[PDB]
RNA sequence: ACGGGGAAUCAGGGUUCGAUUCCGGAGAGGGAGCCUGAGAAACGGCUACCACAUCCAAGGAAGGCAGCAGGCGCGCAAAUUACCCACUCCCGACCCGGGGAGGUAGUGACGAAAAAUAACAAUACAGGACUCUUUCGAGGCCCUGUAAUUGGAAUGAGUCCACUUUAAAUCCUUUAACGAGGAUCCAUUGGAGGGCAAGUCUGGUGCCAGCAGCCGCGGUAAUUCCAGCUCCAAUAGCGUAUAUUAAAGUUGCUGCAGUUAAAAAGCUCGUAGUUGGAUCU
């Protein structure tokens, strides 16, 4: 059945980004998927979204600016502290000067720089490059 | 499958004493010297790329 | 002796390798 | 030149009646200085005589400049036999060794081990 | 239960592959330019600056403030330019990853004393170390590998017992002048 | 696929330590059957008895008789076949004698020609077959 | 299989090893039982049995090297029956005695560090020519070169002397005498078809002898065997056997595969196990 609708909606996110479409319908929506399009919307990969407001669970329609290579999750979420962030970005990202691991902190969801910054730690969701 | 000729070719073959040839060079001397035959002097080169030991 | 040719009739021989190593020696020599 | 000496690292050491100091020897020509020679340069330096002056662990630096060792000059000569060694007193002819090698103590011990009473003198 | 030490390591790599065309040209230039004797001195060089460019890395992936990062990067710049290795206005842990192997390979005594003009050339210089007619300050210096550091290379002379800068004539002067 | 579970690490290592087993090299090295087999006894040589000369005929496309000798181990007494390496170096080993034998360079594998030996002599009567080959030493007369 | 600190290797992740000098444990031929003592189930203490073994005048007595040396045996596999308590410390009634703990040497290519086996010049010649000229040539205007050419310089390997070292010269260092031209004061170990650096040169053998980790070479020009010459790789070191690490993304957590190459259970149910949709500032 469908366990982890953050994969979902990623998946979702990079199958239409590599057909080009302009447009893409995530569904359900979830807090940590808000949080996640934030992260992504902030630095400039998205653009704005809208949040189809059903009475059982929300739908997201996601604008696509052609910028985003990759998005993906990380299951399970492993527990990432700040020494292991440098593994974790060597692991994951295409390059040192651009794309983000988004973590979830007590200070909330964000890139690993802002967690940097931040001095935390966190589990690992997903990134995007 | 008979073990009698055991040091057949090495036996019968003709002996020849070694030549009395110079000393060769030691440690830094000797790698001066492939230093210089290699990278300093192209003297035996015809232009064609051939080997060090080339005899044709 | 020409390596070029050598090769375009000994590289089915016993002498493919030696044939081989002489023609790419002539190509780039350094 | 001539042999030239330096005291590096000087003190007073009145717990054991002596000056202890670390030496340094110019002989930029010569092979290593006699450590008799040493002390009578100390001798005069220190206005004393060079019976109460042990130096020893005289090192010399590679190339052939000087030599670093360590000297002690003592108050009197009873404190020196008294504050001192028994190698270096021997060194100056202050002090004899036992003849004995440690096997023929060892076995003569054990031999004794073996008898009981004034016995224990007629072994050996 | 002893009282000695049995702490060492080796001090060079022996390359993966033993029959690399190119890699051996480049060594053997280096061999023949620097007066080395064998391919290990290429070889410990190597991994000396193998050695440092790995600190450097390291030390790079640290914050730019974090106190260990400041601390090792700065002594490990002053260290690189005490010997002379890197220059003083280049001390960013970034110009680390730009140093050769040639640049550890002229701080050597046998070739600085070429370069000072105390030979005629690099070999000569090779063998005047050894022969104990170099000195370093006030030191005789024995050993071709030694590194000399900024400081030291203004006193570099010919020994006070040399021959050749102290005034002392050899075994076969001697024996020529006897024979006359 | 495979499971992905933060709870997870029993399986995975269960079921890894389980497929070790499917690797042939592993399982030679720590089933302990093929150390038993071994006739050196996971030693890299082993001393033996020369009992007598063979001659093993090579493999198909070749044509030679390889020179060998069976030999019984000193330490269990088993009996294997060593073969004599260089040309003329048979008129080196006499019977009942004693060798030093190495294996062949493919961990107990045949080399080449020859069929089922996987030895190699390496000196006999305690001077090495190579010093005897190029005549630095004698055999002991 | 003694455990750990730790070791080898390793991009990241790991994989192997740890008898071994530090800490903890255990044993003193195998078991067992004790005396004394603060502390022992002690073994350079005792008692007995078992195994082995010693002296015996056959009545008895006496054993315990997995302490340091040394011997036998085992094996692929490992040093002297040396000197000393001077250092480090420990023990004692003790400033003083003792310590095969420990130190010091002997054997030592386990291993690790530094580092010789030549440098320079004149003289054929070679070439270029970040030098001058109607090709030409002057090429000391720089750099090579089996030249056993010649020439003087340098020096330590070695032998030796006095120091110094040290408990005792037991080396290293220091001074001095002698000490290089084939500087005979003579560098080797593996290779030359490919993988893989470097000869289808010459002589011999002729599917023989042998080589060859793998592919392969050898049945009359053998680029591969046996040799000569030459060449190259590392170099006071190099080859071989075995175990192991990387290579191995061929054990895959990172990170593999399952239509046909090895492989999805015949099918469904189902308990542990694993995973589990939105939502609460």
């Known amino acids: ?83 292991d962030l440098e593994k974790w970005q060597n692991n994951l990202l295409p390059s040192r000067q651009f794309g983000f691991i988004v973590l979830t902190t007590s200070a909330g969801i964000m890139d690993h720089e802002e967690a940097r910054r931040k001095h935390t730690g966190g589990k690992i969701l997903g990134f995007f490059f | 499958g008979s073990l009698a000729r055991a040091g057949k070719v090495r036996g019968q073959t003709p002996k020849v004493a070694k030549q009395e040839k110079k000393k060769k060079k030691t440690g830094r001397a000797k790698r001066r010297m492939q230093y210089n035959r290699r990278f300093v002097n192209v003297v035996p080169t015809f232009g064609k790329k051939k080997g060090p030991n080339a005899n044709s | 002796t020409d390596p070029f040719e050598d090769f375009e009739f000994n590289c089915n021989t016993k002498y493919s390798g030696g044939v081989t190593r002489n023609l790419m020696r002539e190509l780039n020599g350094g | 030149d001539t042999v030239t000496i330096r005291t590096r690292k000087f003190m007073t050491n009145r717990l054991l009646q002596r000056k202890q100091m670390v030496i340094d020897v110019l002989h930029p020509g010569k092979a290593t200085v006699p450590k008799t020679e040493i002390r009578e340069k100390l001798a005069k330096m ?32 009873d404190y020196a036999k008294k504050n ?29 081990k073996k008898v009981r009473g004034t016995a224990k003198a007629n072994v050996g | ?74 002594a490990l710049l002053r260290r690189l330019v005490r010997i002379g290795v890197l220059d003083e206005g280049k001390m960013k842990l970034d110009y680390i990853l730009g140093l050769k192997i040639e640049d550890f390979l002229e701080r050597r005594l046998q070739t600085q004393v070429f370069k000072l003009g105390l030979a005629k050339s690099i070999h000569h210089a090779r063998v005047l170390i050894r022969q104990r007619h170099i000195r370093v300050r006030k030191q005789v210096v024995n050993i071709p590998s030694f590194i000399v550091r900024l400081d030291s290379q203004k006193h570099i002379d010919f020994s006070l017992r040399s021959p050749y800068g102290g005034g002392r004539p050899g075994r076969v002067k001697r024996k020529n002048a006897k024979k006359g | 696929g ?12 269960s079921h890894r330590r389980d497929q070790k087993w499917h690797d042939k090299q592993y399982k030679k090295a720590h089933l302990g059957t093929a150390l038993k087999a071994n006739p050196f006894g996971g030693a890299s040589h082993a001393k033996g008895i020369v009992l007598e000369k063979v001659g093993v ?58 069929p089922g030996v996987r030895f190699k002599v390496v000196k006999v009567a305690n001077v090495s077959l190579l010093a005897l080959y190029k005549g630095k030493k004698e055999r002991p007369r």
């Open chain 1, 1 to 83: 059945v469908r366990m982890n609708v953050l994969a979902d909606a990623l998946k979702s996110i990079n199958n239409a980004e590599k057909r080009g479409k302009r447009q893409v319908l995530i569904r359900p929506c979830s807090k940590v998927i808000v949080r996640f399009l934030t992260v992504m919307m902030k630095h400039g990969y998205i653009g704005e979204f809208e949040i189809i407001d059903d009475h059982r669970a929300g739908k997201i329609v996601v604008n696509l600016t052609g910028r985003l290579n990759k998005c993906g999750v990380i299951s399970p979420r492993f527990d990432v502290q700040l020494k």
């Open chain 4, 84 to 112: 001192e060694p028994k190698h270096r007193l021997a060194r100056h002819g202050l002090y004899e060794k036992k003849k004995t090698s440690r096997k023929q103590r060892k076995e003569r011990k054990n031999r004794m």
């Open chain 5, 1 to 74: 239960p002893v009282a000695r030490s049995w702490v060492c390591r080796k001090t060079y790599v022996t390359p993966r592959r033993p029959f690399e065309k190119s890699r051996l040209d480049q060594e053997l230039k280096l061999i023949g330019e620097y007066g080395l004797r064998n391919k290990r001195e290429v070889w410990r060089v190597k991994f000396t600056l193998a050695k440092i460019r790995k600190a450097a890395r390291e030390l790079l992936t640290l914050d730019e403030k974090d106190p260990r990062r400041l601390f090792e990067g700065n």
């Open chain 6, 57 to 114: 005929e090579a493999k198909q496309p070749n044509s030679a008789i390889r020179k060998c000798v069976r030999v019984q181990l000193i330490k269990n007494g088993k009996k294997i076949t060593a073969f004599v390496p260089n040309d003329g170096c048979l008129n080196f080993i006499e019977e009942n004698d004693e060798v030093l034998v190495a294996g062949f360079g493919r961990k107990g594998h045949a080399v080449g020609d020859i």
């Open chain 4, 46 to 77: 220190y206005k004393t005589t060079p019976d109460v002056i042990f130096v020893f662990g005289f090192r010399t630096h590679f190339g052939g400049g000087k030599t670093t060792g360590f000297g002690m000059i003592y108050d009197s000569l």
């Open chain 6, 2 to 13: 495979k499971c992905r579970g933060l709870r997870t690490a029993r399986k995975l290592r």
